[PDB]
Design an enzyme around this catalytic site. Structure first.
Site, PDB file in Angstrom:
ATOM      1  CG  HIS A 194      -2.100  -1.040   0.944  1.00 25.54           C
ATOM      2  ND1 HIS A 194      -2.125  -2.241   1.627  1.00 25.54           N
ATOM      3  CD2 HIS A 194      -3.152  -0.998   0.096  1.00 25.54           C
ATOM      4  CE1 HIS A 194      -3.207  -2.877   1.203  1.00 25.54           C
ATOM      5  NE2 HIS A 194      -3.844  -2.178   0.260  1.00 25.54           N
ATOM      6  CG  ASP A 230      -5.198   1.917  -0.594  1.00 20.70           C
ATOM      7  OD1 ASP A 230      -6.083   1.735   0.280  1.00 20.70           O
ATOM      8  OD2 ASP A 230      -4.962   1.107  -1.483  1.00 20.70           O
TER       9      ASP A 230
END
Ligand SMILES: C[C@@H](Nc1nc(Cl)nc2c1cnn2C)c1ccc(C(F)(F)F)cc1
Ligand SMILES: [Mg+2]
Ligand SMILES: [Zn+2]
Length: 343
Positions: free
Chosen positions: A83, A124
């Site tokens: 991420h 994200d």
């Protein structure tokens, strides 16, 4: 489990926006692997994509503001194995591929496609390499702010996106009317919240019905559901690439998951089996994830867009490759070097 924030432009402005073909002749194809692009060229590629989709001219976007906004979004990502900014960049590239290859303009409003792309960039932001359950268990400030309302990380990603818009010289929607500025915030909220798997699990039966009946460009609800499906297809788009891409992403995802599991153990809590390096069997978990999560998403995309068939076939093919290679991966967790190159 320590992932840092790099903080708290001329090369982008001087060297004008590039034609996408100069980046790669295969840049607009489903066979392009955006992860192959040097990280230092990603902000230029974002600008190039917005220009190629004509969003800069159509929305009269100030290019210096756009360049600052892109650099702020890029700096907004930490460095966990999966991420990170390269994940947001690749998800954003898939949104661009859907625009170029499918007939998005014949299904959604221009503002909705613009919102989908900007959301992909932001979706994200500030991710900590941990899932929603961890925020609750670790009694984090994010859990304190959003747990009672659901989708802890996703609400944070959107709040981070808003904070960037509110930063001096970064407001790409500044000149928008109050109504259009608000529409952008509402679209970005719904699109980012659609990235929570729990939300996808809740609206599945309805996506299953939109494709069963057929897409209607006049149904305001069909526009909302489509954006959710498209956003999840961008999120999981690493599964539509070659075998080597799914293998490398499994390595990154599990390295990140296993670090969360080690942290939960250090806190005296038993982690989920998939996040426990002593229990997790990656091939089985990957096959289950492809069968239950990724494949039904691309099967829906194929049902709505005929040109999307190749995407579903590639995901099915990758799932087949994992089954065939499983006999050569006889261990739980990852090898000592955290690499799956032996496959
Ligand atoms: C956080 C991520 N979780 C994953 N878990 C596992 Cl087991 N493997 C993964 C991913 C992502 N890629 N791979 C290969 C995720 C899941 C579902 C979604 C949604 F469905 F909403 F689109 C968005 C993100
Ligand atoms: Mg997410
Ligand atoms: Zn994501």
């Amino acid at each position: 489990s320590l992932y840092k924030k790099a903080g708290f432009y001329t090369k982008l402005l001087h060297d004008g926006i590039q034609p996408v073909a100069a980046i790669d002749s295969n840049f607009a194809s489903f066979t392009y692997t955006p992860r192959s692009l040097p990280e230092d060229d990603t902000s230029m590629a974002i600008l190039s994509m917005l220009q190629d989709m004509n969003f800069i001219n159509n929305y009269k976007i100030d290019c210096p503001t756009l360049a600052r906004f892109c650099l702020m979004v890029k700096k907004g990502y930490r460095d966990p194995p999966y991420h990170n900014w390269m994940h947001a960049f690749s998800v954003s590239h898939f949104c661009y591929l859907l625009y170029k290859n499918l007939e998005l303009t014949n299904y959604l409003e221009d503002i909705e496609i613009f919102a989908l792309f900007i959301s992909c960039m932001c979706h994200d932001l500030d991710h900590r390499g941990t899932n929603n359950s961890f925020q609750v268990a670790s009694k984090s400030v994010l859990a304190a702010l959003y747990s009672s309302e659901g989708s802890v990380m996703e609400r944070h990603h959107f709040a981070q996106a808003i904070a960037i818009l509110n930063t001096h010289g970064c407001n790409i929607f500044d000149h928008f009317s109050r109504k259009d500025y608000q529409r952008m915030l509402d679209l970005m909220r719904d699109i980012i919240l659609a990235t929570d798997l729990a939300h996808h699990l809740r609206i599945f039966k309805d996506l299953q019905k939109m494709a069963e009946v057929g897409y209607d460009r006049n149904n305001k609800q069909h526009h909302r559901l489509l954006l959710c499906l498209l956003m999840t297809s961008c999120d999981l788009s690493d599964q539509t690439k070659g075998w080597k891409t799914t293998r490398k992403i499994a390595e990154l995802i599990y390295k990140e998951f296993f670090s969360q599991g080690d942290l939960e153990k250090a806190m005296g809590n038993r982690p989920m089996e998939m996040m426990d390096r002593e229990k997790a069997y990656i091939p089985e978990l990957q096959i289950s994830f492809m069968e239950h999560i990724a494949m039904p998403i691309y099967k829906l995309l194929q049902d709505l867009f005929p040109k999307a068939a190749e995407l579903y076939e590639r995901v099915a093919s990758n799932r087949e490759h994992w089954t065939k290679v499983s006999h050569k991966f006889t261990i739980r967790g990852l090898p000592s070097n955290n690499s799956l190159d032996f496959l």
